[PDB]
Amino acid sequence: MWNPIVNVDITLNTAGTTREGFGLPLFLASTDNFEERVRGYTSLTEVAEDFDENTAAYKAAKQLWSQTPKVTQLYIGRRAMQYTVSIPITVAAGGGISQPYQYTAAENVLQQFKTQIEADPTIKDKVSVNVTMIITKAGDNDFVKVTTQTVYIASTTADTASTALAAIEAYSTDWYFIAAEDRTQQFVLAMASEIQARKKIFFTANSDVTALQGTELASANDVPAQLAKNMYTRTVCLWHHAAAEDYPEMAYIAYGAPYDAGSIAWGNAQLTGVAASLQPSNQRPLTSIQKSALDVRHCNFIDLDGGVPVVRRGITSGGEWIDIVRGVDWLESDLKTSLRDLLINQKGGKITYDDTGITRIRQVIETSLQRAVNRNFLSSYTVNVPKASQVALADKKARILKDVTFAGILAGAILDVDLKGTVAYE
């Protein structure tokens, strides 16, 4: 092709800058708009193509990209679906296999449809049918859809938190933050229990009014209280009246996601375009007693210093600051990458099982911990390694090194101030 010696494409749309940090967000939603179990997008424009403005999977993405600087990428997962039919059709399966069905003039019509489906040799084996009517998975099929006015259709999530999380992990392991569309008590608790056994963080919101009363955690039994009782250090709970059908969790995630791990504080955060937590009954900011009631549950909230909303504390349900959790995870990842780079790239040599080879590993561990000390995340550290002359011979045959340990100390920050003074003529 012919290209001009100088090409200039000027436009009038203002644009902003993005940034890269530790971790990427994932939004688990009930959807059927694509076959893959995980799909990524880089801007809100792409999300608008697959989803409409009224879906939660679009609201979550809209909240995320309100903050500045932007997050580089966003992932969306798909939950399993079951469909129901009644009398006040078209059936699809994984791979684009679609078959229509029809009967002409309720149990008789439903049985007619069931017989037609179970007789079809192309799509029947990938789905299941039962009598209202219910359609679910079958065999290897991971995707199923039903669409069609004498016939009515419905849909509902047909999986538990454990199964959906396992099925999504078996597809893509590149994500750190996870938020969910479903906000029922059972699903939230199951997801919180599952993520506790993984190196991920689960952000969730809540609007239960029963959480704003009662200071005794022993007697309280709402969702935040149950999360606090289980000491789920990897769960972050935020209280907000608009958590019924809006997703400020994504704005809170985007507040600190773009930045480096272990070098920021999530408390006193300012979120653009997010209003304070208001009492549902009279739309007035929470009183101090309700804030204390949330405080005893280790649940966050949006406070007003007097004219500005700010998320307060920013602690997980287990009492540990989010900063500590994220910094520890980043530190582990850095150690894992540095030692991997050492062990690989021995393309034509060895790392012998003697003190000469062990000191080389000591060196990389020390360097990777110094990288954390430079961030002001840690302040000091120590490392210990075994002598090659006292390693059991089973390890030398297995070609593995054990008994390596280290310790560190944390730095800290300041978030509140207490002050006293006096005035006098003298």
């Binding site: 003190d355 000191t359 080389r360 000591r362 060196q363 110094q370």
Partner: protein, 143 residues
């Protein structure tokens, strides 16, 4: 009683992920601080006030044999660092392992500072490599 025994054979040096070997016949390692810890000031009347210097950098000089294979590795490492952007990091901890405890220091964020002089004659001459460090830390096994 007698103190612990020194053994040059069981001394290992490491930096940038590689092991440095082939020590010279004599004086194969040196460690030193750049500035002293304190600097007294005496007035005309005899009063004394102490200044505590904040500088803690140092130098690590390691000397190797003429035909040691560790000379090639350091030259190859130096050649790479000349073609790297300023934003890329070039420092790494200089770790010395000594079971006798006769060396009390380690180099934090050390860098390569000078290249060896090359001389040839009837016999073999050693080659000296010089490193720096942000903080030459002196530690000990707590009694």
């Amino acid at each position: 009683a007698m103190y612990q025994q020194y053994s040059p054979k069981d001394v290992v040096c490491s930096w940038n992920g590689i092991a440095i070997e082939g020590f010279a016949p004599d004086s194969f390692l040196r460690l030193q601080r750049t500035s002293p810890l304190v600097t007294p000031v005496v007035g005309a009347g005899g009063q004394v006030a102490l200044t505590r210097n904040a500088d803690k950098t140092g130098t690590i000089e390691i000397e190797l044999m003429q035909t040691s294979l560790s000379n090639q590795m350091l030259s190859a490492i130096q050649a790479k660092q000349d073609n790297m952007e300023l934003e890329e990091d070039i420092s790494s901890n200089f770790v010395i392992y000594d079971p006798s405890g006769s060396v009390l220091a380690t180099g934090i964020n050390a860098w390569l500072q000078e290249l060896p002089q090359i001389e040839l004659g009837r016999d073999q001459n050693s080659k000296t490599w010089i490193f720096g460090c942000e903080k030459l830390d002196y530690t000990s096994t707590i009694p």
